[PDB]
């Protein structure tokens, strides 16, 4: 049973977050008891500043509270890669992947021609006039027949413009072995093996 | 990350349980896209759970009345007291339907090896509840610290003219005894019961 | 995979439950790689089994003589008589040291929804074992078709006059009733046991 | 349990990678409601793979033949050797379809410290097969030793006529970057395949 409304509200608001059930909202609820009042405060105010001082980047897509994201700002950053990606998480991946420093841009979604939603309901247009020559488009869509197929859009669409497009590489992960690897990825880590010495 | 919104959300994430640094920040970019009214709904009722929820002072189970709907109803049994470790039991003895007695919250549970006797244990309150003609279930868990606080509690609630009872070990609904520990259905065996 | 005897190793494997057919593969691997003596070890061992392995005739519990090790064992309440549903069921409560009497193994439960009557499972030889002055601790499972065949069993048996337990529900060692369902709590707070006087 | 066929055949079984104490007991009792044709017919693939299968010559795949029928297939690329740590890795490149070539297993990796150098595997016999105009396919995984082994090969090869190539290091089918290694998406970017030059 749950009597006082204000643990069922919390219960519920909890709940609504990904990852986090019923059950696991209510460990949650009891344990926000257990905490002294400048957390709760503290985590109340850290949601609703970021609810204000987040918006996205109005070039690239990514996340931020100014008026250009701190990787469009920054100018040490390469001005001549874009790297395309579903999700402003993406950018944090292939940023804490130590191997990256040009620009990106966020589609904040995938395309799926079954629920009707296109390249509209994807930050694809802002996209178009960042492209320019002597610069390279990074296809970091994810490896789903939605991704796959975003990409394979993103390619045709910056095709006119002149940069060079790419596209990650469908491999077997770090630290794995072929026998657990799926079908479909061997094959393309074959049909895409690099040359590491030529005779 | 960058910006100082997201940075202390995370931070201010990462620190409730069943949560680590990636899951808070998954967590920060799905409340980003959230419209305003479900964060000021989240915020509210986190402030609102700490304003108004506190310990029953009879039971100490959680509340927001001057007493709780368990002690407040007069429909209940004031002759039985089941001491449970903690206020998520009282949720789950309650759903079962099958107790109308009463309970008491201890915050906590005896764990010697990591520094806890009953010093840290709040029984304050409880032993003045306890006098003659009434039944102590000790509802603490089975666990090597459960059996233990109950054991102190044993000890402790029997001078008053308690009568203490224990949650039965058991086999579990829908349990499969091949696929139940041996000492458990050692115990399920002899406290099995005439059912003829 | 073309050698036929690899093939067959992966689908003789592919037939025990648990073991599936990229999972047999593995297997077939594994053993490939081991010495004569340890396939040899293995293969003697099922022959083995199915050559001295059969059901207590009287109880039905797993055995290798005549009748079986508790059956044939002296020092044993040969008053009471539990049934549960596996053999691997006498394992656990053997292995439990709580329990010397005797066992009857069903060998599965009622299932309606799967045309599996009392026909089905070895009630019948368990009819003539029960007689007043008597127990059957009816220690089937806790599952709803474990609780059913048990009550089936309590209605069969109760005119002969035995007394009829069912093993006790409850919390199992080693939890909180935070991770412990509802249900459960329920009964194992109805079941509780008086631990002092009042 | 005291039967010593269940209790022998639990022991042998229970050595199998991937079956525990309580699996093990479980498969035993299955064999048990099985018919001794079953048994035979196992404990046969059993002994009989242990008697045909041995270690290709050539390329040490899994065969009964003098010579693994990849090797023997005069239909598949005589010039590629796609080098692979384990026969599985075999049966494992054999499904994606897209290969026509030869392999070469390797039967384990490096991984030196814990005493296994290249002699213990089946480097040596795999230099003769390699010339001028063929191309080595370093299939090796991407564990530590598995990209060290890859690297050894390399530097190994080099010197012979053929080219050589490595497994493509990246993300795998059916995933989002959210959800992928840091290296993994690190060695996706650098080894990113352009796909339409300027
Ligand atoms: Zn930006
Ligand atoms: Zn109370
Ligand atoms: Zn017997
Ligand atoms: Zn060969």
Same mark, same amino acid.
């Given at each position: 049973?749950?009597?006082?409304? @204000?643990?069922?509200?919390?219960? =519920? $608001?909890?709940? /609504?977050?990904? *990852? ?21 405060? =503290? ?5 609703? $500043?970021?609810?204000?001082? !987040?918006?996205? #980047? ?10 250009? #994201?701190? %990787? ?13 990606? $579903?999700?402003? *998480? ?5 940023? /804490? @992947?130590?191997? &990256?420093?040009?620009? &990106?841009?966020? !589609? ?8 009707? %939603? ?13 492209? *320019?020559? *002597? ?18 859009? !993103?390619?045709? +669409? +910056? $095709? ?5 497009? @790419?596209?990650?590489? &469908? ?5 794995? @072995? ?22």
């Amino acid at each position: 049973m749950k009597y006082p409304p @204000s643990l069922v509200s919390l219960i =519920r $608001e909890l709940s /609504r977050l990904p *990852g986090i059930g019923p059950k696991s909202a209510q460990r949650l609820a009891f344990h926000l008891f257990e905490q002294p009042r400048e957390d709760i405060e =503290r985590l109340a105010s850290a949601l609703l $500043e970021a609810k204000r001082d !987040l918006h996205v #980047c109005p070039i690239c897509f990514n996340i931020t509270d100014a008026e250009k #994201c701190d %990787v469009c700002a920054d100018p040490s950053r390469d001005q001549r890669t874009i790297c395309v990606v $579903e999700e402003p *998480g993406d950018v944090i991946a292939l940023e /804490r @992947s130590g191997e &990256y420093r040009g620009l &990106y841009h966020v !589609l904040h979604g995938v395309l799926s021609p079954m629920n009707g %939603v296109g390249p509209d309901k994807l930050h694809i247009k802002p996209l178009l006039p960042r492209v *320019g020559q *002597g610069m390279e488009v990074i296809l970091a869509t994810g490896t789903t027949v939605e991704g796959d197929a975003t990409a394979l859009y !993103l390619q045709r +669409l +910056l $095709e006119p413009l002149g940069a060079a497009i @790419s596209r990650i590489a &469908y491999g077997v992960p770090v630290g794995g @072995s072929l026998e657990y690897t799926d079908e479909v990825t061997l094959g393309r880590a074959l049909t895409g093996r690099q040359t590491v010495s030529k005779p």
